[PDB]
Write a protein that binds this DNA or RNA. Structure first.
Ligand SMILES: Nc1ncnc2c1ncn2[C@@H]1O[C@H](CSCC[C@H](N)C(=O)O)[C@@H](O)[C@H]1O
Ligand SMILES: [Zn+2]
Ligand SMILES: [Zn+2]
Length: 834
DNA sequence: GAGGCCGCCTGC
DNA sequence: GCAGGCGGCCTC
């Protein structure tokens, strides 16, 4: 009711006199106290905030600054959240004291000084541990920022964080050269923490500028002819026009300019920073020259051509800084330079767009002259053959002692690639129990890891139940494989590592209305871990495959919570849907490159083009490459050292019938079972594959052009399935027309890869009749080999697999692609520094 | 055995 | 509307 200032006003401003205390209804209030408020726009019952400032206005009104908390129910957590728990957020605002509903108790819960070694009345008392970022779903440690002489009156973490953020992202001119008739020339500018100078290079969107070389529009493909429905009875199911793994809609990688001039104008006597122009020399990517794509197949993805072509461009369009060097200017070798840091390109020649020839670069294209990092001791659970820890190893952040893998062939393979790790094949529940019970070793004399040994913990838990392909996920098997993530969390609790990584399939975020996700995040929060989740697309990290994977990252209290890696390669946009919705809110990762990227998309050609031809059933585990690496990608995976022998280029031996089918799948992109002819085929011995027979009306699909029926079963007519309607050994598989109408016509089954395209998600057993079925070679009539699958996953050719062909396929299919793991690992490395 | 057969699927 | 996709289960 009545509000009155208690005490002497501190630091009186011009329009404000700030106070540290006030009285409302006999109750005493002070800065740092917390308070309740009732919202007007609320579907949410209550608001809670800290009082940062108490000033009175010259308008006579009496004000305070509110730094809002967030209730765990308003975070990704939701109803799983602890009801007493609040999080700090970047919401704050000025408000009239009249609005305070009450004074509430809010306590800060710090991670214990012993935190690492743990994990074995009052109408209500609120608490907070972590600061929440609503946009990225990041739970991070509170800022350490402290108030001082001038701050103590208005000090607000939200305000500060906002001021720093918009200060850092706003464009500013650093150095000025000369003013002429209103135009200012600048030597130095900055935005978003990056400093740009004359002579630096810059990433622009593909649309920023064009090249003197122009691309040709010409004639689109006219219908080659009407199809013959008698011969090709299932072709009509192709009306969609969508080609799985097509690269046609893939964006171009960034344009790259070299900065020659920088200018802007003036506004109100001062330089207008909001508008800054850059004048650039354009670089050509090889595919931008007349050579186009088919002339660039063999070039380094980071090689450019210098040109004197210029363009003017807006600063605001700059996507970031990159390094471009003249090869001969290099103190080190080109490989060493390319491998030494991100955003690194080079050029040897220059491109004349007029003459279409390559020249030594002009003198002005030349540059002037014209800490041992300790590896985290890592424990890899559900290690598989080791893809994930292989990626971490390439990133130099981890040395993996202790892998746990239950499936023997995978553990063997891990061992073969990891001479220095103790690999336990036990059930992880059992092992955890053993170490919990005080055991130093296991029956085999393998030393168990103990609290303090494990710095980093990582793994993919079984994805079989979480997979959207799994019809039976509701049964006992899939559920059993589901409790394992809780087991993994138990490891995290017990060992309390500095860094935590959990990987799974994308569907892991949507499963059981996102309950799994919510519960594991809640778990990590209870433990006191900084954490976050996100979905990454492997393709954006340099393999030619669509693999969308859920990644959950946690960091111990003392650490810095890593960020998800920014995409390196462009990739087809439909295959890029990375957002997740939980409880009606949309969440995205910290990732800012939504359209383009620094490197061109890695292709199927780039992946397997060097592999010797083989037939269905090839069993030769060691055969010579006959040839050199044909691509950048192949060069990266084959190494530079003499290595004449190609391993695992074997492929499954498919039945005579399946092999005839494969033989009749056309080579063209988007080819699959729907292109099969309906014809009789002589199989092995006296076995004959008879035509498929259509004896039922399909009430949905109607009659063919010829007038034939389209049904293979009575269910086509809305009647119940009749067994004995089932036809055997037909070229066109009976079951596909059977259920096609509710399966999207089983697109991709017996499908081919295309050279210019990418692989569909590489699974544990390539099967042309499997739900993910375009496993055919772009050319040869056979399923992809183990080597080819390994390549699709970005494994080095030297990585060893163990067991029979199905075993190796499964080890490959299960793995986190090393390039993805490498990217994530580099983010972690970023945290290890500072 | 590994291949024929497949969800009142999910998700934007 | 239609495209995704470390699949499981039952047996030629
Ligand atoms: N109960 C259990 N205890 C320990 N390991 C198990 C297990 N159940 C399944 N596994 C194993 O966990 C493995 C996960 S495969 C994951 C591979 C890894 N992420 C990589 O990059 O290579 C499977 O191969 C499976 O055999
Ligand atoms: Zn504020
Ligand atoms: Zn039927």
């Amino acid at each position: 009711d009545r509000i009155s200032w208690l005490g002497q006003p501190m630091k009186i401003e011009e329009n404000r006199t700030y106070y540290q205390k006030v009285s409302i209804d006999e109750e005493m209030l002070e800065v740092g106290d917390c308070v309740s408020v009732i919202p007007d726009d609320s579907s949410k019952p209550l608001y809670l905030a800290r009082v940062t400032a108490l000033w009175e206005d010259k308008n006579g009104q009496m004000m305070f600054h509110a730094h809002w908390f967030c209730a765990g129910t308003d975070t990704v957590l939701g109803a799983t959240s602890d009801p007493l728990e609040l999080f700090l957020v970047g919401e704050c605002e000025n408000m009239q004291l009249s609005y305070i509903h009450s004074k509430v108790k809010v306590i800060y819960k710090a991670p214990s000084e012993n935190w690492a070694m743990e994990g074995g009345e009052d109408g209500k008392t609120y608490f907070f541990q972590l600061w929440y970022n609503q946009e990225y779903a990041r739970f991070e440690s509170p800022p350490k920022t402290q108030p001082t002489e001038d701050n103590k009156h208005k000090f607000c973490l939200s305000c500060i964080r906002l001021a720093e953020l918009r200060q850092k992202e706003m464009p500013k001119v650093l150095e000025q050269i000369e003013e002429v008739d209103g135009r200012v020339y600048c030597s130095s500018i900055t935005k978003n923490g990056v400093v740009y100078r004359l002579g630096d290079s810059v990433y622009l969107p593909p649309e920023a500028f064009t090249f003197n070389i122009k691309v040709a529009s010409p004639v689109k493909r006219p219908k080659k002819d009407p199809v013959n429905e008698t011969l090709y009875p299932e072709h009509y199911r192709k009306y969609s026009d969508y080609i799985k793994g097509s690269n046609l809609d893939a964006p171009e990688p960034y344009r790259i300019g070299r900065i020659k001039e920088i200018h802007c104008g003036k506004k109100k006597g001062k330089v207008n920073e909001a508008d800054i122009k850059l004048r650039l020399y354009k670089f050509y990517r090889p595919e931008n020259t007349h050579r186009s794509y088919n002339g660039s197949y063999h070039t380094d993805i980071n090689m450019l051509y210098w040109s004197d072509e210029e363009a003017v461009v807006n600063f605001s369009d700059v996507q970031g800084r990159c390094t471009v060097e003249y090869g001969e200017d290099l103190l080190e070798s080109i490989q060493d330079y390319s491998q030494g840091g991100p955003d690194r390109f080079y050029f040897l020649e220059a491109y004349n767009s007029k003459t279409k020839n390559f020249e030594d670069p002009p003198n002005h294209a030349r540059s002037p002259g014209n800490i041992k990092l300790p590896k985290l001791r890592t424990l890899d659970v559900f290690s598989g053959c080791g893809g994930l820890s292989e990626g971490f190893h390439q990133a130099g952040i981890s040395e993996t002692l202790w892998a746990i893998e239950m499936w023997d062939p995978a553990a063997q393979a891990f061992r073969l690639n990891n001479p220095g790790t103790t690999v336990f094949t036990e059930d992880c529940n059992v092992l955890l129990k053993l170490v919990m019970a005080g055991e130093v070793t296991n029956s085999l004399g393998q030393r168990l890891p103990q609290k303090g040994d494990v710095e980093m913990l990582c793994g993919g838990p079984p994805c079989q139940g979480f997979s959207g392909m799994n019809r039976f996920n509701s049964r006992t098997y899939s559920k059993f494989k589901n409790s394992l993530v809780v087991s993994f969390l138990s490891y995290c609790d017990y060992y309390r590592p500095r860094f935590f990584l959990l990987e799974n399939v994308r569907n892991f975020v949507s499963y059981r209305r996102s309950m799994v996700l919510k519960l594991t995040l809640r778990c990590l929060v209870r433990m006191g871990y900084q954490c976050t989740f996100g979905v990454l697309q492997a393709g954006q990290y340099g393999v030619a495959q669509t693999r969308r994977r859920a990644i959950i990252l946690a960091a111990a209290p003392g650490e810095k919570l890593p960020l998800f890696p920014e995409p390196l390669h462009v990739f087809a946009p439909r295959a890029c849907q990375l957002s997740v919705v939980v409880d009606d809110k949309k969440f995205v990762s910290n990732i800012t490159r939504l359209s383009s990227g620094p490197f061109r998309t890695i292709t199927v050609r780039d992946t397997m083009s060097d592999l010797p031809e083989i037939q269905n059933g090839a069993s030769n585990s060691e055969i010579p490459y006959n040839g050199e690496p044909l691509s950048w990608f192949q060069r990266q995976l084959r190494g530079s050292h003499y290595q004449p022998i190609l391993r695992d280029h074997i492929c499954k031996d498919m039945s005579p019938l399946v092999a005839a089918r494969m033989r009749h799948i056309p080579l063209f992109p988007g080819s699959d079972w729907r292109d099969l002819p309906n014809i009789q085929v002589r199989l092995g011995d006296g076995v004959i594959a008879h035509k498929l027979q259509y004896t039922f009306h399909d009430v949905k699909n109607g009659y063919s052009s010829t007038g034939a029926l389209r049904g293979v079963c009575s269910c086509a007519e809305g009647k119940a399935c009749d067994p004995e309607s089932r036809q055997f050994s037909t070229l066109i598989p009976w079951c596909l027309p059977h259920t096609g109408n509710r399966h999207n016509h089983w697109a991709g089954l017996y499908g081919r890869l295309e050279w210019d395209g990418f692989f569909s998600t590489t699974v544990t057993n390539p099967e042309p009749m499997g739900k993910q079925g375009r496993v055919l070679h772009p050319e040869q009539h056979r399923v992809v080999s183990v080597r080819e699958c390994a390549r699709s996953q970005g494994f080095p050719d030297s990585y060893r697999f163990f067991g029979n062909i199905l075993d190796r396929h499964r080890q490959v299919g299960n793995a986190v692609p090393p390039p993805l793991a490498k990217a994530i690992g580099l983010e972690i490395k970023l945290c290890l520094l500072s």
